[PDB]
Amino acid sequence: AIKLYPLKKLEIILEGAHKEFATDLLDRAGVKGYTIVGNLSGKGSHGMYEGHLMFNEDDALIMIIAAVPEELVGPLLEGFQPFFEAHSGVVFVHDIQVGRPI
Amino acid sequence: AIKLYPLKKLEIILEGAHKEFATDLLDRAGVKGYTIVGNLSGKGSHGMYEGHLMFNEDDALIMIIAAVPEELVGPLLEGFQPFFEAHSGVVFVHDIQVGRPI
Amino acid sequence: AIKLYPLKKLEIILEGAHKEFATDLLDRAGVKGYTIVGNLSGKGSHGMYEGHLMFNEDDALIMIIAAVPEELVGPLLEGFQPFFEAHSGVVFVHDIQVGRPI
Questions:
Q1: How many C-beta atoms lie closer than 10 Å to residue A48's C-beta?
Q2: In this complex, do A35 and B61 lie within 8 Å of one another by their Cβ atoms?
Q3: InterPro entries from the entry (chains A, B, C) (predicted)?
Q4: Which of C2, C9, C34 sits opposite A92 (nearest CB)?
Q5: Of C33, C34, C97, Cβ closest to residue A93
Q6: Is A32 helix (H, G, I), strand (E, B) or coil?
Q7: Number of domains into which chain B is organized
Q8: Which among A76, B60, C63, C76 has the fewest CB atoms less than 10 Å away?
Q9: What are phi and psi of B85, to 5 degrees?
């Protein structure tokens, strides 16, 4: 008896050093949880505006994953933007669905 | 001479201890393969119904990825649901495409 | 003042041994950057045509992630196809959006 709920999935890629910042940001905005993939590396621009700080080969990156109602997305990107002005990183927004028993 | 095929991509996040369970479940349902990302960690609710068991900071999580025909999705979520009633974890369903030569 | 841009997100899963090949391929095609998730493992067919080489249990896999304009996708899948004819692996194409300040 499963029904699908639409949500937005955010993949937040940034340096590991800034994990606590990013994660307090999610907490304060009312995100109900996240998971973290470690040991990413990277290179160059990952889809952002020209001039956005690139990754390079000695960045230890993580990916923070948050599944979030659509309404939370705008406020979260506005929250991260001051951060991205001075640090490398990107947020990929996806459509996903999650199954819940009726 | 590439043509795109639509499929569903499942990201199954759960504790590593239950890898074999989850993976027998995929096998028995006729999923043709999967990949596994190790060394995830997590915290809190990741998009599920209120009361669903949260992750916490000493969970060693994995992500199982299966690309699956649309028809297999309902049966797979029904398969995992008894499991999720007593264990933390989530399944993210995405739309993806995979290229095949004509 | 955020506006969303649509892009294609490619998840390229293959053996670690072939990282430099795949990554020169992205460079030569004009992809502006990528990130890499290490320590994947896998098994079987991951959505490809019947007969495509499967992963097995002693493959050390990586995932290469590139966010790419829609126009770059066809040429990139054509680039990888000779490679996939003799090696295991897959490319998952997603729709994503990335936020940019106006």
A1: 22
A2: yes
A3: N-reg_PII, N-reg_PII-like_a/b, N-reg_PII/ATP_PRibTrfase_C
A4: C9
A5: C97
A6: coil
A7: 1
A8: B60
A9: -65, -25
> Which candidate, A37, A26, A6, places its Cα nearest to that of B13?
A37
Token pair belonging to B48: 């599920």
CA–CA min distance C90, chain B (Å): 8
Alpha carbon separation from B34 to A102, B3, B66, C61, C81 (Å, rounded): 28, 22, 5, 12, 20
Indicate the resolution in Å: 2.3
The residue range of the domain holding A74 is 1-102
The answer to whether A88 touches A33, Cβ cutoff 8 Å, is no
Residue C88 main-chain phi, psi, to 5 deg: -65, 160
Residue of C4, C12, C24, C32 to mutate when probing chain A, most A C-beta within 10 A: C32
- Touching check for A98 and chain B: CB below 8 Å? yes
B82 within 8 A of A101, measured Cβ to Cβ: no
Pairing of strands B33-44, B2-15: unpaired
Residue B92's alpha-carbon distances to A78, B64, C1, C62, in angstroms, are 25, 10, 29, 20
Residue of chain C minimizing CA distance to B1 = C78
A 14-43 near B (Cβ less than 8 A): 23, 32-39
CA distance C69 to chain A (A): 9
Of the candidates A23, A92, A15, the one whose C-alpha atom is nearest the C-alpha of residue A54 is A15
Listed in sequence order, the residues at least 6 apart from A91 whose beta carbon sits closer than 8 Å to its beta carbon are A10, A11, A12, A13, A76, A77, A80, C98, C99
Q: Is B65 on the interface with A (CB under 8 A)?
A: no
Tell me which H or E stretch contains A78: helix A73-84
Q: How far apart are CA C46 and CA C44, in angstroms?
A: 6
Given CB atoms, is C53 within the 8 Å cutoff of chain A?
no
Residues of each annotated binding site of C for AMP: 45-46, 67, 88-89
**CATH number for the domain harbouring residue B88:** 3.30.70.120
Distances (CA, A) of B26 to A45, B9, B47, C52: 36, 13, 22, 20
Q: Which residue has the tokens 């995992």?
A: B80
For chain A, what is the largest distance between any 2 Cα atoms, rounded to a whole number of angstroms? 49
